[PDB]
Design a protein around this ligand. Structure first.
Ligand SMILES: CCCCCCCCCCCCCCCCCC(=O)OC[C@H](CO[C@@H]1O[C@H](CO[C@H]2O[C@H](CO)[C@H](O)[C@H](O)[C@H]2O)[C@H](O)[C@H](O)[C@H]1O)OC(=O)CCCCCCCCCCCCCCCCC
Ligand SMILES: CCCCCCCCCCCCCCCCCC(=O)OC[C@H](CO[C@@H]1O[C@H](CO[C@H]2O[C@H](CO)[C@H](O)[C@H](O)[C@H]2O)[C@H](O)[C@H](O)[C@H]1O)OC(=O)CCCCCCCCCCCCCCCCC
Ligand code: CLA
Ligand code: CLA
Ligand code: CLA
Ligand code: CLA
Ligand code: CLA
Ligand SMILES: CCCCCCCCCCCCCCCCCC(=O)OC[C@H](CO[C@@H]1O[C@H](CO)[C@H](O)[C@H](O)[C@H]1O)OC(=O)CCCCCCCCCCCCCCCCC
Ligand SMILES: CC1=C(/C=C/C(C)=C/C=C/C(C)=C/C=C/C=C(C)/C=C/C=C(C)/C=C/C2=C(C)CCCC2(C)C)C(C)(C)CCC1
Ligand SMILES: CC1=C(/C=C/C(C)=C/C=C/C(C)=C/C=C/C=C(C)/C=C/C=C(C)/C=C/C2=C(C)CCCC2(C)C)C(C)(C)CCC1
Ligand SMILES: CC1=C(/C=C/C(C)=C/C=C/C(C)=C/C=C/C=C(C)/C=C/C=C(C)/C=C/C2=C(C)CCCC2(C)C)C(C)(C)CCC1
Ligand SMILES: [Cl-]
Ligand SMILES: [Cl-]
Ligand code: NA
Lengths: 449, 238, 37, 145, 45, 30, 33, 48, 33, 61, 58, 187
């Protein structure tokens, strides 16, 4: 290992001693990758061992199995689990690959060359050789593009993926004719992030998702080649700090943004996160409650269209600020929700009064009731319901877990952008250790600020 | 946008554009309204869309005049989906009736000088009569606030306090109107409809309407103000 | 659940997921072994 | 005004639960002699169970201004039960001083509050001026250790 | 309809550019500041 | 009239902040 | 008491002791830590 | 995600619920809940 | 309302462009060190 | 072949225990790696053989 | 410092004047009513469910 | 006892969730989490228990003398349940209202009879069983489910009524209410 006397970094910053040790840095990164794959495999095995296909996935607190099921792999129409074996196969494969990666990390961390510059020039970066850093970026960018095209191939020629918008309760569909139109695909990124627009979180079709991943894979491969064969422009040299900690800070900012995006994706989106596996969203549960009570009071005579609430605004139906007919009550805040079980009841001007009277099918009612009883509300100790409950139900929605956890991770990695980026700037300038004490900048400035 | 043009569009092509609040407009009919075939029709798809709101105000000289206002509640003032009956007579006599549908909309205009005037724009149970050129009638105007509505201090009919509990020494006749006088008595309004165009083959009609109804009485706290609402209406016969 | 062949090995699978949080504790143990050199 | 005695249509004497000192507002409940709630002024007039009208409560005043006067209309009975939850019922002239209608505190309450706050502040005074006394040599400054 | 509105809320408009004049002024302002920077600083790429 | 008093108090506080920022006594070094 | 519980405890003890055991073996052996 | 919910977590031999300070906190929470928005709720569960 | 929108768009674009092109104009060399 | 698969899986678990507890020891030991290349190679080879045997036994039954 | 008497009087006279202070007063009222029965057992408050203040559909 | 000792490594007594209760002439099972209640809205109530969490969930047994020889002497079960219209509370509000949805003019509460039937017993005893849903203008807890079980024996009518909020009913109070209704047995 190392010591503080020869490095200047204490034990609580010991990995910082690896900044200029290329081989051991590679070993550490490979070991952490092996850790990631090991958690993937072990947690997948844990979930399948604790899984009963009779109950819905979101009832049993599973996060990885919904991810595998969204890709097909043993789900029938309506999100019914047919074979749990593919989940087991995925767990075993990720686990064994993790064993291999862990051995590799151990080797490259203990016995492998400490610095790769001399013996292995192909792997000998210098943290300031801009061409070499761009080459590494290009290699890993090509790998990412290949992964995106792998997803596209899975959806195209390998059984498709689980479309929750398919007629009926949703089913595994083979996506043909992906949305490869530039305007449609790039209109999401420039779309507003507010209500009704939702930025890229509001992607609703599988065709749009597959076309977008097509564009991203192609662009990532092309950009990998470009960043391989080119050196940053002279204006790029002046704009950025060129050090390992600087690159780390840039990546930290990027992945903090991605973590926030994933949190919002899990909370709001129900296309890439079908409610059959992840359970209803917040808006979905609220709309489901309103719909269930509407159909209950409509079955008991009454006329929900003319039913006036206590505020004089409409007990079951009202008009969105734009004019679209929407469910009344507080759920008017979620009027822009769209779900597989409510779209058939929507006409050109929103919810249709005629369809809401006779076109409702029993499966829609059952799904709405189930979503209402499993709203994404829970406690820290996994007690379902609002904060004022009887501590009888054991349920917290997987969407809530994903949203909370990855939001915390996104915030902490933004703090990482701040910390590691400021330190990169200071170290490049030379202030990393403190004021000069012989030539303070402030003492060279005119008084009174 | 006629009925077919509106119906062809999908929800995603309409959400966010304000088209929903607009009522459909007949486009290929004939202005000669006397050509409609007499008979009894089940009037459905009945919709009403205001074009202006004016509030009656009486000045110092007693000249009760209607003042234009500014709308506050956005595009939530269109009645649609209503069903009813209509009897076209040979001479043009009309027996208009409205039964169901989204026949009420709570709105709030603002009067110059900064007055918030809420009201239920409604045509509930409008039993009209008159000629085919113009038929008038009365309609029910329910209380703007339901009985279970709670005032900012918890007072209200049915569920409520019937007392200003914030003053444990003041519940006397000086506050009779505010306490326990939550009068939810329904009022009446007057409306006049004129048929502008009729499509006989489609069987649809459209025209202009003018209605006068009281404002929100705030559960009997203050007197109602007269609201005049002009607009255009559409409907389908049988 | 697991396929019937792997049913007896259920305890091992139930124990596996906590190893990643054991690795960081192992790093702290290793640092303590060298007197936090 | 006198003493208000509340009696149901059965003839069972009912007592109004008095407001505890902690409660700014207290719901009106009329209780049987055996501590069984027999009437109240419900917050939810829909499907009420112990309503004044439902139970038929009448209030008879003995002594005071209203002596031998019995009121049976539910509005007056509700008003007098609400007044009686505060204790004995009195007539108040509020026009003279323009009384707002919220209880003030008696002079003993104000005395206790003022002298308790002064007691706390003077405990801090003991602490401060006594610390200055004991540490007079060092309260002009300290010569390091 | 009793008044006039932008009627753009809840739409997938890029940058909120419902009319081309907004996009043109955005491009003009960004391009003008870029021209100042380019004729003062050195951008090549 | 209460609104006038509240506005005056807020304006006074903001003016005091402005004077303490831009008309402060210079920090004398040594 | 349960056989599954017994095996769970055995596996837990083994995996917990794995790390400190290799640390101790490397310390007594003299390996570079 | 909410905090800990230990409501009715303590029960006696026969099953009667033994109240705790968490139960008194829950009573106060119920008091706040049924009054926070008097007229905005048309359905029993808030969920929003 | 359109005039207000275009005015605000111009203002926001102006300030954001100033930010972007000010942080590009050789900012890392603007330190005393 | 269920029993055969189970005993093979137990053998794989034991070999993984041995590798996990020995490979760090061999690597970090002074001169340990050079004198123990054959032992570690045999351990890794038998570990992979056990993995593939478990795979084929799972395929069969 | 429970109340601002001016605002309480105005709300009593004006059934449509509302501020966050009045909403807080309503919340306090709910807390008191729903916590009194079990928080202070010595009072023996057997309040029927119809006297407890409560909003709509909650 | 003082020297009884703890229950370390012991076994539970019962986890069924229901505890027996013996009345004057009836047997019942009450939920474990439900506490005995003191209030008697009707003077003829001889038993009452209430939920610990939500006091809307409760039940009470009323025993009152009846002139009818048997429960069948009241007539049809629907006629019998129409006889006891006061058990669903009383609308104290008396104001003209039409601004409430789903309710008739001047009404703020409505009871819907979901179903009636007749049950049997080990001795052939006949029980009138009723299920009602009461909704209000404020929609308190989305309505209330009322279960009624009535019988006449030895010149006395026994009537058990169980009330549960719809919000509670959806999330598992239905099991407790149905258990209470089933366990009601009279001589
Ligand atoms: C500054 C304002 C940030 C608002 C925001 O952004 O937060 C919200 C957005 C997501 O927007 C939501 O996007 C949703 C998309 O769902 C829609 O589309 C979905 C597609 O499956 C479903 O159909 C769903 O039913 C339907 O409602 C809805 O449009 C919501 O109204 C909309 O608020 O987060 C995002 O874009 C991701 C960005 C999160 C930034 C977090 C910053 C933390 C510091
Ligand atoms: C120090 C940390 C506390 C010590 C560990 C306590 C603990 O955790 O022990 C509790 C659980 C084990 O609980 C067991 O598992 C279940 C947990 O509920 C889960 O399973 C239930 C079904 O059984 C439901 O599906 C429910 O929705 C689902 O949440 C039940 O409670 C079982 O009865 C119980 O035996 O540990 C676990 O799960 C393992 C937890 C591993 C880490 C998970 C992190 C996820 C959260 C990230 C940040 C989120 C939010 C920010 C912070 C706040
Ligand atoms: C996953 C997180 C992680 C990773 C991958 C690394 C990786 C690394 N650290 Mg580090 N560290 C971490 C977390 C991590 N650290 C944390 C949280 C702290 C704070 C306590 C530190 C503090 C720290 C300090 C102070 C130092 C390092 C150093 C090092 C490097 C040298 C390792 C070495 O030779 O030590 C010795 C190796 C051993 C003693 C062998 C015992 C551990 C091995 C790996 C057994 C692993 C068990 C596993 C089950 C084996 C699987 C085998 C496989 C076939 C299945 C190395 C690349 C050193 C350095 O800077 O490099 C020059 C250094 O001085 N770290
Ligand atoms: C990001 C992943 C990564 C990278 C960049 C490298 C890079 C490198 N490895 Mg490594 N390795 C890895 C993962 C990786 N490895 C994994 C997962 C394992 C486990 C199978 C190994 C096991 C391994 C061994 C056994 C050896 C290398 C060796 C080498 C070096 C020889 C170059 C070559 O021939 O190829 C090189 C710098 C050789 C070396 O270190 O030279 C002494 C060598 O002996 N690697
Ligand atoms: C994550 C992968 C990745 C990374 C880390 C980089 C990194 C880099 N690229 Mg590269 N690039 C990539 C992918 C990547 N690129 C891909 C996939 C392509 C193919 C399209 C390219 C094509 C490309 C070209 C042509 C060039 C670079 C250049 C550069 C260097 C300058 C960066 C810069 O201009 O500052 C920051 C960039 C900007 C300030 C401009 C922003 C432009 C985007 C499109 C704005 C879009 C905004 C839109 C509304 C979305 C907002 C949502 C958002 C908040 C998430 C830099 C080191 C330059 C270079 O140095 O040449 C080698 C250069 O000329 N790249
Ligand atoms: C304690 C650490 C931790 C843990 C346990 C998790 C766990 C998880 N994260 Mg998370 N994350 C973390 C830290 C963590 N994260 C941090 C620190 C950040 C930065 C702030 C993020 C940012 C992040 C994002 C942005 C996302 C997640 C997501 C996820 C979930 C899916 C994981 C996944 O699939 O990744 C990705 C998997 C890969 C990169 C490998 C995929 C390789 C290929 C493409 C797979 C294709 C398979 C193919 C189709 C099958 C073959 C087909 C063939 C036959 C044709 C998962 C439960 C995702 C999520 O569910 O959102 C909530 C999500 O998108 N995380
Ligand atoms: C891929 C991300 C990444 C990477 C590669 C690095 C890499 C590095 N960091 Mg950095 N950092 C990151 C993210 C990252 N960091 C984030 C997100 C933050 C914000 C929290 C920080 C904040 C940070 C600080 C303050 C410092 C570093 C430092 C360092 C250097 C030495 C680190 C070390 O070994 O300390 C040793 C590792 C430990 C002592 C282990 C820490 C134990 C943690 C706190 C346990 C928490 C786990 C907890 C259960 C998870 C809950 C999270 C949330 C869900 C609640 C090193 C090069 C040091 C430096 O300045 O560089 C020279 C330093 O002082 N980092
Ligand atoms: C995460 C953000 C994802 C969205 C990126 C595009 C955002 C967008 O297009 O906004 C477009 C949005 C929405 O714009 C609105 O959209 C509505 C619906 O379409 C209507 O069309 C409105 O008329 C329109 O104004 O505008 C904004 O919300 C703010 C944009 C400007 C914010 C500038 C902040 C700059 C700060 C730092 C810059 C650093 C460099
Ligand atoms: C460098 C270093 C570090 C780190 C390390 C690491 C992290 C490594 C990796 C590691 C790893 C991560 C490894 C892996 C492992 C795994 C394995 C080896 C596996 C195995 C498997 C088996 C044996 C089998 C199993 C089975 C099957 C498959 C079926 C089902 C059932 C069961 C599960 C039983 C630390 C921190 C210490 C610090 C110091 C330095
Ligand atoms: C896949 C998919 C899709 C698509 C997507 C896309 C299309 C993406 C792309 C995206 C993008 C396109 C992104 C980009 C981004 C960019 C950025 C984020 C930038 C930033 C910038 C920076 C960071 C800079 C800064 C600075 C300045 C400004 C100044 C000076 C200094 C510096 C240079 C540093 C969709 C939707 C269909 C959905 C489904 C899936
Ligand atoms: C038992 C069983 C089975 C089987 C299993 C197996 C047999 C698996 C395999 C596994 C494996 C066997 C995996 C693999 C792994 C490996 C890894 C994961 C590594 C990779 C590599 C890397 C990561 C790196 C690379 C490189 C170098 C070295 C040089 C330079 C360049 C680069 C960086 C590229 C089945 C299916 C029946 C299911 C059930 C159970
Ligand atoms: Cl509020
Ligand atoms: Cl609601
Ligand atoms: Na409420």
């Amino acid at each position: 290992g190392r010591d503080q006397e020869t490095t200047g970094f204490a034990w609580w910053a010991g990995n910082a001693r690896l900044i200029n040790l290329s081989g051991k840095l590679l070993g550490a990164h490979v070991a952490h990758a092996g850790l990631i794959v090991f958690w993937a495999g072990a947690m997948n095995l844990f979930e399948v061992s604790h899984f009963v296909p009779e109950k819905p996935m979101y009832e049993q607190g599973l996060i990885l199995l919904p991810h595998i099921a969204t890709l097909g792999y043993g789900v029938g129409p309506g999100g019914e689990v047919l074979d749990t074996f593919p989940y087991f196969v995925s767990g075993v494969l990720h686990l064994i690959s993790s064993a291999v990666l862990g051995f590799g990390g151990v080797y490259h961390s203990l016995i492998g060359p400490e610095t790769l510059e001399e013996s292995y020039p192909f792997f000998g970066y210098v943290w300031k050789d801009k061409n070499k850093m761009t080459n590494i970026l290009g290699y890993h960018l090509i790998i990412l593009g290949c992964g995106a095209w792998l997803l596209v191939l899975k959806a195209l020629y390998f059984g498709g993926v689980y479309d929750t918008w398919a007629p009926g309760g949703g089913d595994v569909r083979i996506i043909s004719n992906p949305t490869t139109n530039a305007a449609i695909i790039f209109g999401y990124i420039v779309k507003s992030p507010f209500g009704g627009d939702g930025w890229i979180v509001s992607v609703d079709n599988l065709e749009d998702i597959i076309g977008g991943h097509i564009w991203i894979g192609t662009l990532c491969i092309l950009g990998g080649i470009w960043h391989i064969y080119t050196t940053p422009w002279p204006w790029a040299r002046r704009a950025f700090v060129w050090s390992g900690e600087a690159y780390l800070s840039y990546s930290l900012a990027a992945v903090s943004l991605m973590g926030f995006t994933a949190c919002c994706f899990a909370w709001f989106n129900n296309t890439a996160y079908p409610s059959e596996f992840y359970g209803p969203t917040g808006p979905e549960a609220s709309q489901a409650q309103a719909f269930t009570f509407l159909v209950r009071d409509q079955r008991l005579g009454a006329n929900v269209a003319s039913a006036q609430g206590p505020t004089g605004l409409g007990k079951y139906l009202m008009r969105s600020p734009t004019g679209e007919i929407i469910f009344g009550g507080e759920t008017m805040r979620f009027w822009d929700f769209r779900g597989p079980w409510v779209e058939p009841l929507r006409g050109p001007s929103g919810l249709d009064l005629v369809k809401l009277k006779n076109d409702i099918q029993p499966w829609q009612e059952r799904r709405a009731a189930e979503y209402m009883t499993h709203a994404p509300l829970g406690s820290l100790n996994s007690v379902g319901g609002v904060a004022t409950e009887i501590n009888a139900v054991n349920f917290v929605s997987p969407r809530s877990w994903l949203a909370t956890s990855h939001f915390c991770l996104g915030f902490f990695f933004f703090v990482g952008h701040l910390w590691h980026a400021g330190r990169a700037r200071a170290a490049a300038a030379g202030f990393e250790k403190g004021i000069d004490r012989v030539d303070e900048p402030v003492l060279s400035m005119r008084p009174l600020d | 946008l006629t009925y077919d043009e509106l119906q062809g569009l999908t929800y995603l092509q309409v959400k966010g554009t304000g088209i929903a609040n607009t009522c459909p407009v007949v486009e290929q009919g004939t202005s000669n309204v006397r050509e409609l075939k007499p008979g009894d029709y089940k009037l459905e798809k009945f919709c009403m869309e205001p074009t202006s709101f004016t509030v009656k105000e009486e000045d110092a000289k007693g000249r009760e005049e209607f003042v234009k206002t500014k709308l506050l509640t956005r595009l939530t003032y269109g009645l649609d989906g209503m069903n009813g009956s209509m009897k076209i007579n040979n001479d043009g006599s009309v027996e208009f009736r409205e039964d169901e549908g989204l026949d009420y909309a709570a709105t709030t205009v603002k009067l110059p000088g900064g007055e918030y005037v809420p009201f239920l724009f409604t045509i509930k149970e409008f039993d009209g009569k008159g000629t085919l050129d113009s038929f008038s009638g009365d309609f029910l105007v329910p209380s703007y606030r339901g009985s279970t509505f709670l005032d900012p201090k918890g007072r209200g009919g049915a569920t409520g306090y019937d007392n200003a509990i914030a003053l444990p020494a003041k519940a006397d006749a000086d506050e009779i109107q505010r306490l326990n006088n939550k009068s939810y008595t329904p009022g009446k309004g007057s409306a006049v409809f004129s048929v502008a165009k009729v499509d006989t083959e489609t069987g649809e009609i459209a025209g202009v309407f003018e209605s006068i109804q009281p404002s929100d009485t705030e559960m009997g706290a203050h007197p109602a103000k007269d609201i005049k609402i002009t607009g255009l209406w559409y409907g389908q016969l049988t | 659940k697991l396929p019937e062949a792997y049913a007896p090995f259920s305890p091992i699978v139930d124990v596996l997921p906590i190893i990643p949080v054991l690795f960081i504790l192992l790093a702290f143990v290793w640092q303590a072994s060298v007197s936090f050199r | 005004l006198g003493h208000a005695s509340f009696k149901d249509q059965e003839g069972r004497e009912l007592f109004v639960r008095r407001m505890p000192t902690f409660f700014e507002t207290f719901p009106v409940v009329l209780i049987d002699k055996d501590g069984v709630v027999r009437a109240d002024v419900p917050f939810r007039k829909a499907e009420s169970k112990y309503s004044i009208e439902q139970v038929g409560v009448s209030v008879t005043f003995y002594g005071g201004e209203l002596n031998g006067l019995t009121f049976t209309d539910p509005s007056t009975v509700k008003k007098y039960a609400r007044k009686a939850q505060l204790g004995e019922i009195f007539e108040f002239d509020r026009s003279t001083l323009q009384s707002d209608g919220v209880f003030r505190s008696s002079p003993r309450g104000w005395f206790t509050f003022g002298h308790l706050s002064f007691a706390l502040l003077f405990f801090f005074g003991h602490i401060w001026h006594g610390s200055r006394t004991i540490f007079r040599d060092v309260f002009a400054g300290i010569d390091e250790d | 309809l009793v008044d006039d509105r932008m009627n753009g809320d809840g739409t997938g408009l890029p940058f909120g550019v419902n009319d081309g004049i907004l996009g043109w002024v955005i491009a003009g302002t960004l391009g003008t500041i870029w021209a100042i920077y380019f004729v003062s600083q050195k951008d090549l790429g | 009239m209460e609104a006038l008093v509240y506005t005056f108090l807020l304006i006074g506080t903001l003016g005091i902040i402005f004077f303490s920022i831009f008309f402060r006594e210079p920090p004398r070094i040594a | 008491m349960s056989l599954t519980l017994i095996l769970q405890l055995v596996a837990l003890f083994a995996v917990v002791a794995a790390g400190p055991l290799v640390v101790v073996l490397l310390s007594v052996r003299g390996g570079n830590l | 995600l909410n905090g800990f919910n230990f409501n009715q977590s303590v029960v006696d031999s026969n099953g009667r619920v033994l109240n705790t300070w968490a139960d008194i906190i829950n009573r106060a929470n119920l008091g706040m809940e049924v009054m926070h928005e008097r007229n905005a709720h048309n359905f029993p569960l808030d969920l929003a | 309302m359109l005039t207000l929108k275009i005015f605000v768009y111009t203002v926001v674009t102006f300030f954001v462009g100033l930010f972007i092109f000010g942080f590009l104009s050789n900012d890392p060399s603007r330190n005393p060190g | 072949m269920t029993s055969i698969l189970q005993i093979a899986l137990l053998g794989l678990v034991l070999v993984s225990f041995a590798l996990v507890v020995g490979v760090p020891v061999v690597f970090a030991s002074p001169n340990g790696w050079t004198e123990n290349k054959g032992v570690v190679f045999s351990g890794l080879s038998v570990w992979f053989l056990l993995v593939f045997a478990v795979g084929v036994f799972n395929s069969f039954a | 410092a429970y109340d601002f008497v001016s605002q309480e009087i105005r709300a009593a006279e004006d059934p449509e004047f509302e501020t966050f202070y009045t909403k807080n007063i309503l919340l306090n009222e709910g807390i008191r009513a729903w916590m009194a029965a079990q928080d202070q057992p010595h009072e023996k408050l057997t309040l029927p469910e119809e006297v407890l203040p409560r909003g709509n559909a909650l | 006892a003082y020297g009884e000792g703890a229950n370390v490594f012991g076994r539970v007594t019962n986890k069924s969730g229901f505890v027996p209760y013996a009345g004057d002439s009836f047997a019942l099972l009450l939920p474990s989490k439900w506490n005995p209640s003191d209030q008697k809205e009707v003077e003829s109530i001889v038993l009452r228990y209430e939920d610990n969490f939500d006091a809307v969930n409760n039940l009470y047994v009323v025993e009152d003398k009846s002139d009818k020889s048997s429960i069948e002497a009241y007539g049809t079960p629907e006629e019998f349940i129409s006889q006891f219209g006061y058990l669903l509370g009383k609308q104290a509000w008396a104001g003209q209202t039409v601004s409430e949805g789903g309710f008739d003019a001047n009404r703020v509460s409505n009871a819907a009879l979901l179903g009636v039937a007749t049950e049997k017993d080990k001795k052939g005893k006949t029980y009138y069983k009723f299920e009602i849903l009461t909704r209000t203008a404020d929609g308190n807890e989305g309505g209330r489910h009322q279960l009624v079980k009535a019988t006449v024996s030895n010149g006395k009518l026994y009537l058990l009524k169980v009330q549960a909020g719809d919000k509670r009913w959806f999330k598992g109070t239905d099991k407790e209410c149905l258990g209470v209704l089933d366990s009601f047995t009279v001589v």
